[PDB]
């Protein structure tokens, strides 16, 4: 018994494209679902980053907390659509992988930032 809320594609566009969507609680960039991609897919021609910053978000629909991996899509200039700047549980650089003030496209073949995705890792425990 997963739960409808655990899958963006079934959620109204107005919901997942809002900076208020529960799993975008630590996004600092542009939502890929508004750039020709989806919450878990890079828009055509953009490259997924192997690394990312981690957020612990609260799913208000099931009352549980989940780990979200914020991977970037790289290789293209700023998407400029659906800019979000949420900092829930975000921490400074000394806790590097929980920090979102650094471009997570940094290790890619090409580091120019295109947009940000919100991948569901699993329950936070």
């Amino acid at each position: 018994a997963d739960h409808i809320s655990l899958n963006p594609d079934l959620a109204n566009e107005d919901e997942v494209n809002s900076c208020d969507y529960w799993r975008h609680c630590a996004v600092d960039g542009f939502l890929c679902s508004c750039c020709g991609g989806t919450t878990t897919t890079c828009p055509p021609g953009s490259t997924p980053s192997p690394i990312s910053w981690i957020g612990t978000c609260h799913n208000p629909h099931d009352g549980k907390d989940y780990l979200i991996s914020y991977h970037d899509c790289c290789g293209k200039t700023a998407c400029g659509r659906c800019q979000c700047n949420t900092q829930t549980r975000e921490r400074p650089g000394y806790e590097f992988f929980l920090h979102n003030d650094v471009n997570w496209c940094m290790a890619n073949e090409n580091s120019t930032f295109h947009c940000t995705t919100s991948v569901l890792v699993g329950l936070a425990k």
Binding site: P50, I51, S52, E95, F97, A107, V121
Partner: protein, 128 residues
């Protein structure tokens, strides 16, 4: 048997969040493969076995040890065992005698490479 091959990718993940060791096993060998392709200097991985709530402490002390000490304080008494730090394409292995895991207590395996233990953490248990 007394074998296990755990993977690590450029995405900072282990292909296992739990490994079981049969009681029949005398000593235990744990092999690590780095399936990614980023150099160890940027995304190296290792596996460190230690007491579950004694993990944070080891990673912090390991960070201060440096890559020269595979990010594990030299001779840290809290470590049951630890592999070397490998990079993309590389592989390593560690053999430790299971006679070390204490009764009732919980043990987790993880990567001490700076910042990875938060996600690359798992639980290693005995028999059943």
């Amino acid at each position: 048997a007394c074998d296990v091959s755990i993977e690590g990718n450029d995405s900072m993940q282990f292909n296992t969040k739990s490994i079981v060791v049969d009681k029949t096993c005398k000593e235990f060998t744990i092999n690590l493969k780095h399936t990614g392709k980023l150099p160890k200097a940027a995304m190296g991985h290792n596996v460190v076995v230690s007491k579950k709530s004694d993990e944070s402490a080891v990673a912090t002390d390991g960070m201060k040890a440096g890559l020269n000490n595979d990010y594990v304080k030299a001779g840290d008494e809290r470590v049951i065992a630890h592999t070397s730090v490998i990079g993309g394409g590389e592989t390593d292995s560690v053999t430790f005698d299971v006679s070390k895991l204490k009764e009732g207590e919980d043990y987790a395996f993880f990567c001490s490479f700076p910042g990875h233990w938060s996600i690359m953490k798992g639980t290693i248990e005995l028999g059943s």
